[PDB]
Amino acid sequence: AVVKCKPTSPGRRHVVKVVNPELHKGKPFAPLLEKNSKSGGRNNNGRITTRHIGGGHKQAYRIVDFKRNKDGIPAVVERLEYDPNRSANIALVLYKDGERRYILAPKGLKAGDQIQSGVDAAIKPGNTLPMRNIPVGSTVHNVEMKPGKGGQLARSAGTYVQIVARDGAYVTLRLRSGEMRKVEADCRATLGEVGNAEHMLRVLGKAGAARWRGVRPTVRGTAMNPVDHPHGGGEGRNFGKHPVTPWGVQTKGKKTRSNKRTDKFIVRRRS
Template sequence: MGHRIIQQNRGRGGPTYRAPSHKYKADLKHACPNTETVKGEIVDIEHDPARHAPIARVALEGGKKVYALVTEGMGVGDEISWGPEAGVQNGNTLPLRGIPVGAYICNIEAKPNDGGKFVRSSGVQAMVVGKTTGKVAVQMPSGKQKWFHELCMATIGIVAGGGRSEKPFAKAGNKHYKMKSQAQKWPRSSGVKMNVIDHPFGGGGHQHPGRPKTVSRGTSPGRKVGHIAARRTGKWKK
């Protein structure tokens, strides 16, 4: 009997495709809701296996310690704040209505008090481009404009760790550990390189699919590879 194809194994949910969430350090939510203001001091800059950007361990005024996303220019000993009374300076987090147009921001909430959902990857930033009654327009890293509620909180600055993707892995072991932390199977082989019992495109005297690559939406799981429910096929004509 042949092996399951990758899509079937991933859907089954085995340990190979399960993210190692037991190694992650924190959810990186904002330290307070948008109605309070708290201050803290950065105690240490750490690495979190859950993300490529560095994180900061912050000691709050009451003695509680939380983790926060690091922006470029932050360091140990710096003081940062969360809340509507926080100043507009690097590393501080405040509601969008209090951030001036043209400021770079990151770690933006999708809705008020959800802790931050958007623009959290290393080296990225968004920009406040406009305001209206109850809403704030933000230009996302993709270049598209998105509207947020004015009470959604965001952090001032650019996420640290820029240029990470430009550094070569140099060794296969480095790539192995990166892919393992992201719950991705690596290395991967294309279907045409496999045996005929292991993949619908496998087998044959030379590497070729041997069958149409476009399949319907209702195809059985063992055959659902290639262009699934493609709207069109063939070369674009001018």
């Protein structure tokens, strides 16, 4: 649930929280956890590859099951759980065989609901089947791009795709980006939308709330000296040139997609 806190102090007027009581107020299933040390935006060479990364709260990685290869074995939901490594919530399930696993939380799932994977599974949210058997015009999430590796699309808080057509060994999809992409007609996909849509309405309210996420301040460039950035400086606010990243790239329309390898599944890229 979304709630607007009161302005009892500068730093809480425009803050907004997303409170969900369905989440388990305790410790998670340890057997599915592992170490995850932050990187600060650096690489094996110790150099900063991506800026604005550093600090924040500690984190543990919940091993999620994105493949869903446990076919023909139903499972019930034990409880929901908060996952920091991602924007979406997850679900702790229980298979009849005694095994437990993690998955992404669909829109309206709860505890006690039964789910099943495979080709003969039921057409209901949570269940997983290959798109070869999914009806056209439906909504799914956690889509696979190559059979067997695991889902890669529609993994975020409130993201969902829509199957629009299936001709042959391939299926076409309109992604949440408006792009019209096609994939092999054997990839698995989970019905329903990922349920945390109240996440976008969240608000940090103050800078410190960003530093908890591991985000660092972003220096513009205009106020940064000529040696540092193309925008450089000048007495006052001049910026009398074209917008450009460091290293000399426009950043205001210049398409940098230079794949040219697949370039077949793209139909209606966007806009």
